Design an enzyme around this catalytic site. Structure first.
Site, short mmCIF file in Angstrom:
data_model
loop_
_atom_site.label_atom_id
_atom_site.label_comp_id
_atom_site.label_asym_id
_atom_site.label_seq_id
_atom_site.Cartn_x
_atom_site.Cartn_y
_atom_site.Cartn_z
N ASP A 128 0.96 -1.18 -0.05
CA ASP A 128 -0.08 0.00 -0.02
C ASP A 128 0.85 1.31 0.04
OD1 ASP A 128 -2.36 -1.89 0.55
OD2 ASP A 128 -1.37 -2.00 2.66
N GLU B 250 -11.59 0.12 -1.63
CA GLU B 250 -10.69 0.55 -0.63
C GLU B 250 -9.61 1.36 -1.23
OE1 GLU B 250 -9.31 -2.88 1.42
OE2 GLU B 250 -7.67 -3.44 -0.10
NI NI Z 1 -3.06 3.95 -0.28
#
Ligand code: NI
Length: 443
Positions: free
Chosen positions: A12, A198
């Protein structure tokens, strides 16, 4: 002589540039840095008391670990505010439920130490939620996946969310890094009913004057069908729409369901999903479940970049950071370079360089764990496409690609690139239609 890549593992990845160096911050308090976006240096990898970003982290963030019942942190964002300090939006989640806390820590220097300023959002409580009503994961967010950004008017915002009640945006105090008071979970942009959406990220493009909301659809694992999507708005806090003009606000799974992929699939522009250029008689690049991206606009050069993690065909759950250059098409939507960044730029392309056979990836519009396969087409001198699909091609101006395929008009770019697997130069095109479907050509 040839492009050198040094790989890192930062799940991420959240990009930030400071003092002529690029950094990515990810989950598990992992981080890496690079001067050229090709050769990355791993800095940290996991949460522990010897992680230099947050000395004695289990004490510093005791309350967050306690609320979330976890020993790790999820997707961090770091943002430099006007005071020149670095603000880390940290979060933790139990992982089997939206039991989460989000807070902010501040550092004088980019590589830390970051010191806790406090928690400001929670989710997964049994009673009253942050918006004043009892917590309901079908309508309230999981307070994870922050990205904090300035808009074109100097206002500070934070978009966030993963699954659960959807994606929300909060207005933030530029002096403290905390949300302004009395917003609850903030303004909803999309999601709800445990939609597999997300990793929200917003990038303003001055040249088109749109804010672009990047999102991850699906699950991050090898069978999850992770893919990168995008929508846009005139304002940072919405309303956001996709290329067809669908309002994102109503995009969600059906009531009484969990992870309804079918209901969200048709909405949002799909930039990239699982693919491979490899064939039985030819090696090629390939990704499984690319996603959770940030994006960077380079003010000096004017170039844009997509920064994300990805898994790979045949390599299970191991992940690395990738960077792909982004180009804006005629309609004001981005297209991704088919190959990772290796110093290429939009140069003049001549028709003599374009004609020939291309491997074609059609990323489609679905959430699917199926790795997209190539088909062959020919771009002919007579400005017609022939082969496993048909239509017309033309180069507009310097390098704009106007292509028709299956009676659908696509717009994007022609781009000479480096294939780091075959270790050869390739002519590519990357284009997108009004339905938000992306097509990659490699010659
Ligand atoms: Ni991110």
């Amino acid at each position: 002589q040839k492009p050198i890549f040094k790989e890192v593992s930062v799940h991420d990845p959240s990009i930030i540039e400071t003092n002529g160096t690029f950094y990515v911050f990810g989950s598990h308090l992992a981080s890496a840095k690079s001067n050229d976006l090709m050769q990355w240096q791993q800095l940290t990898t996991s949460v522990s008391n010897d992680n230099p970003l947050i000395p004695n982290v289990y004490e510093e963030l005791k309350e967050t670990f306690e609320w979330a019942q976890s020993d790790t942190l999820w997707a961090a964002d770091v943002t430099q505010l006007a005071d020149g300090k670095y603000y880390m939006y940290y979060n933790a989640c139990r992982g089997d439920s939206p039991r989460s806390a989000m807070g902010v820590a501040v550092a004088d220097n980019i590589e830390g130490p970051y010191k806790n300023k406090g928690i400001f959002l929670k989710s997964g409580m049994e009673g009253t939620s942050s918006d004043g009503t009892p917590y309901d994961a079908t309508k309230h967010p999981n307070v994870v996946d922050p990205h904090t950004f300035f808009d074109k008017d100097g206002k500070l915002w934070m978009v966030y969310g993963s699954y659960s009640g959807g994606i929300f945006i909060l207005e933030m105090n530029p002096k403290t890094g905390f949300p302004l008071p009395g917003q609850g979970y903030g303004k909803k942009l999309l999601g709800g009913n445990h939609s597999r959406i997300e990793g929200p990220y917003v990038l303003y493009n001055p040249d088109t004057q749109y804010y672009y909301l990047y999102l991850s659809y699906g699950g991050l694992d090898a069978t999850g069908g992770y893919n990168i999507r995008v929508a846009r708005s005139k304002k940072p806090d919405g309303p956001y729409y996709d290329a067809e003009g669908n309002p994102m606000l109503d995009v969600r799974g059906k009531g009484g369901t969990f992870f309804d992929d079918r209901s969200i699939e048709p909405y949002g522009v799909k930039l990239m999903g699982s693919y491979t250029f490899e064939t039985e008689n030819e090696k090629g690049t390939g990704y499984v479940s690319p996603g959770q991206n940030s994006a960077y606009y380079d003010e000096k050069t004017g170039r844009s970049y997509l920064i994300f993690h990805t898994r790979f065909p045949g390599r299970g759950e191991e992940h690395e950071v990738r960077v792909h250059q982004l180009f804006m098409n005629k309609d004001g939507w981005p297209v991704a370079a088919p190959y990772r960044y290796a110093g290429e730029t939009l140069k003049e392309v001549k028709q003599k360089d374009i004609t020939g056979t291309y491997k074609l990836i059609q990323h489609g519009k679905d959430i699917s764990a199926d790795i997209k396969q190539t088909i062959n087409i020919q771009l002919n001198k007579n400005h017609t496409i022939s082969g496993e699909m048909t239509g017309t091609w033309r180069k507009t101006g310097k390098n704009t690609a106007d292509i028709t395929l299956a009676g659908k008009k696509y717009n994007g770019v022609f781009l000479r690139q480096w294939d780091s697997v075959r270790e050869k130069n390739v002519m590519t095109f990357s284009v997108l239609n009004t339905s938000g479907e992306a097509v990659w050509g490699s010659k």
